[PDB]
RNA sequence: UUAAUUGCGAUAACGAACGAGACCUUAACCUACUAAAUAGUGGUGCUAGCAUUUGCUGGUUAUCCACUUCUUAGAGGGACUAUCGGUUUCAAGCCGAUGGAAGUUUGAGGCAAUAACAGGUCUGUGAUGCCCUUAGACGUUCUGGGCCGCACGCGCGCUACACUGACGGAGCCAGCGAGUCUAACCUUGGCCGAGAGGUCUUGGUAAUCUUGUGAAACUCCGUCGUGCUGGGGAUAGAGCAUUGUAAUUAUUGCUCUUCAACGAGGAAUUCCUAGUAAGCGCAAGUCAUCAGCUUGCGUUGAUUACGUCCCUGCCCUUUGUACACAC
């Protein structure tokens, strides 16, 4: 009913935008374990996008009057169009920022 | 008359050979008969701790006793009814006679 | 002799017996139409085969499904597998074997599980745990 | 002594007791064999219960 | 034990259960141009009570501008029919 | 978990050494002759023996 | 061609039966309705005072029509539910035997449902006729 | 919507049956806010008074308030089956009495001091501030201060 | 190389034995050899709703025909990686695709290596050895108190922070599980209550009776609706009761109330590879009476696992040792 373009298309655009492409892995380092900036995972990209959208929708839908359906729909549209406000996309870009910082 | 032989044993081999010899003698005697109706096998389970005292891992064991019950319903003269009932008697298998 | 074929769809415990015969072209479950069980979701799920194959193949065929066992999803899955197998048996026994083959090809192309019954039978539970593989808790002190 | 056994023991652990060792603890009422679990472990093979799983 | 808090004032919403003409005309002139309408929409974009929002939704739909897409409980969706 | 036990391997080899021409490369006929050409206490064990027997016939058929 | 409560949706048909029975008002209500909670597990009584007894009667009568022979214990088991037993975990609890028995008696009095042999109760001829008439009214009103 | 004058009839906190009640909720749950009577008795009283539940708690008539007053004064005079009440076959007389917000606490204190005076095990437990209903106190009831 | 001293193989070893496998059950696919008024179809013995249109839903035995292709059965059939590619001193093996039940020994269990704990159990014994008591004894007549006193700390768990929820109404789905003979087991009722209980046996020596165990988050119309609320019966006082010759320091169930914690819950710590995690429910065990426990089953169902030893442990080999009650 909103965003009258293709609904699966906006869904997939949100998935790609929220899918993190640089992450951090625990490197032993020696005593002080560090983070290592690792690129490359398409399956993990889509997996993390789905997980991020779901947990953001449920965090929005916890303890409030708006129902999980409209919270999830708003999160999907916000992530698809790009607003730097949705919880999934903020977490993804913050993880990206720390990954590039410790890169 | 509608007599009935029902057998409620535990040893499947003796159960099956009792049934087989009964049906084979009936077939060779050329009577009218109903097939052996074979009730579901009833398994008695007892679940108990292996240990006598309470020490060790909480490990359990299940002792199972299997009971096989079959029955056959016949109509015949009294003399041959008693003949069929009293021949082919085997230890371990318990059989009894009912009506209708 | 009214030509009826007996198939059955299976699940964890849901058994659905399907009687498919030459009639007026109806589908009924427990004497009530498949179209009017009103789940609003499982209705479409059981429509799936009928929607994908069209009404060309149910001109004068009556299919009666008697269900017993399992939850709602298990029952509808048993229903769909039984009705698919019943239509397959009808189109093999009476309609052309070529028609049966092409019907099964379309069913497989839409989904491979349409033809194959699920066999993920429940795993028995062992002592020392609440479930099949889960243990209770390992407290040391 | 008429009062030596005046108090009834019609139920509880006074009624149920092991029929091989007079042990009041661990009895298996199931199937009416009335044998404590520790003795049933020993005698099950000849009693009829057999171990499969 | 410990209260695990600071004991400060919360949101303390003033969800309207009764209104007047000054808010009725505002909601009447606002219910257009609303692509998606529900109880949450009414409450958050109107700052009105849940019961009043539900009553307004029922009355507006009984008159008829918006049409429903889902009648499922806990989630009602209404879109204005152009 | 495809490694055969020494009993299966040795029984298959013994079958091959003394009945090479009597049996062929098909599993179904191999088992349907093995059940009577060797006494085994398990249908599954017969299946394993005949499967390895077929594998060795395939091995000999090329080298 | 062919009207039957199985062929009709359940909720709308039972609502129609409730409205029809409410219009007629000749069921000989027990009189202590509006004070009972329809069960023993509910923590809050029902909502409508003069209502819900037509609903319970329609439901029981339709359930009897589906089934063959059913007694008060079966009614209670059927209408029971999980009860919030505080900290102890939820358990199934039956419905109210008194209300199930009294709605059976009311159906008996109105002739919708009658005693049957071998123990139990069966949907009566006129009760079945009225039920199918209400269902057919539903098919005529919706279509 | 329905227009009611912005008079003193709307107050942020009001008095009802010697307690304080905030409106903007259902009348039945406002009655539940009264100490000693809860949702069950409130809904029973409203339903037997035949006042519509879907109606709000804004307009209530003087005859209706007197109706509720008379119901609470003489519930048996209003044909109530006498097992909904919270004091069955009282020790003083044996009649059925329905408590008020103050009456319930006074009655509770009266039976508490009665148990203490009679020096039962229950009275001793209530004096000592322990669990009396036979609960397991070896690991529970620590933060009793 | 997967789980394997599992095998292929080189070789002072050859030939063996025990463990692993092999084996025995469990759940899966059988339109077959043989099936009963316990799961049905058409005429019928009797009858109703959509009508004189061909059917469904109903309700019953002796009045019969065709079958267990759904419950269960017994000489019993297949599945062994079958086939087709890629990879190798061109040797065992691994990785991908088909009717079909899945190609991680199909998944899961049972007993389980001449080795040892100075682990538990002398509270399971008319199994004793060594000491305790040897006619006011630990054998035993009756009354009671007690893992129910806590100042306190630690564990399997159950209910919860609720609008993916609580409640009210219409649907409402498993079987392996249990059952009176020297005097009762689970329950089918004419009457009363959301409750237990009486008159007779429809249930019996039991797939036919309880029981399709009509048992739960599961499908729809609303109320509560973010405000510490309707999630707490924690806690405490009023009445009915099955059991017990005593349920009083709620054994247990049902009618009524206060509001004390709860804004991703700190150091730490436990389980989870295909229907397992988890959620919810059912049956047996202990029982004179009640499950928050255990053993089994049923409903929905899991992203990161065919990877690695970084932590905790292992197995083999080499190695060092001042260790050998063995770090």
PDB file of C-alpha atoms in Angstrom, chain E residues 18-21, chain H residues 1-6 56:
ATOM      1  CA  UNK E  18     -12.597  12.991  25.303  1.00  0.00           C
ATOM      2  CA  UNK E  19     -12.193  15.747  22.719  1.00  0.00           C
ATOM      3  CA  UNK E  20     -13.933  18.825  21.317  1.00  0.00           C
ATOM      4  CA  UNK E  21     -14.682  20.514  17.999  1.00  0.00           C
TER       5      UNK E  21
ATOM      6  CA  UNK H   1     -18.061  13.509  19.364  1.00  0.00           C
ATOM      7  CA  UNK H   2     -20.465  13.821  22.282  1.00  0.00           C
ATOM      8  CA  UNK H   3     -20.102  17.254  23.882  1.00  0.00           C
ATOM      9  CA  UNK H   4     -20.123  17.508  27.680  1.00  0.00           C
ATOM     10  CA  UNK H   5     -19.530  20.868  29.346  1.00  0.00           C
ATOM     11  CA  UNK H   6     -16.032  21.478  30.737  1.00  0.00           C
ATOM     12  CA  UNK H  56     -17.430   5.323  29.294  1.00  0.00           C
TER      13      UNK H  56
END
